[PDB]
């Protein structure tokens, strides 16, 4: 059972890459980009 009862998600927009949230569309656009080869292979 998940007795959490918490977690935001009342935004009309929500990134698809990560799943972030933004009350405005633009905010989501200028964000989605962040998922464009911003960093290299930080694992292995």
Interface size with Zn ion, residues (CB under 5 A)? 4
22 has which bridge partners?
13
Residue 18 in the binding site for Zn ion (CB under 5 A): yes
> Is residue 20 close enough to count as binding Zn ion by CB under 5 A?
yes
Q: Which is nearer to Zn ion, 16 or 43 (CB)?
A: 16
Residue 15 found at the interface with Zn ion (CB under 5 A): yes
Q: Considering only CA atoms, which of 13, 18, 14 is closest in space to residue 38?
A: 18
Q: What are the CA-CA distances from residue 16 to residues 22, 28, 29, 32 (Å)? A: 12, 10, 11, 8
- The site for Zn ion (CB under 5 A) is made up of 15, 17-18, 20
């Amino acid at each position: 059972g998940s007795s959490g009862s918490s977690g935001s998600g009342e935004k009309p927009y929500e990134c698809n890459e990560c799943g972030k949230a933004f009350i405005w569309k633009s905010l989501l656009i200028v964000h989605e980009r962040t998922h464009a080869g911003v960093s290299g292979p930080s694992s292995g």
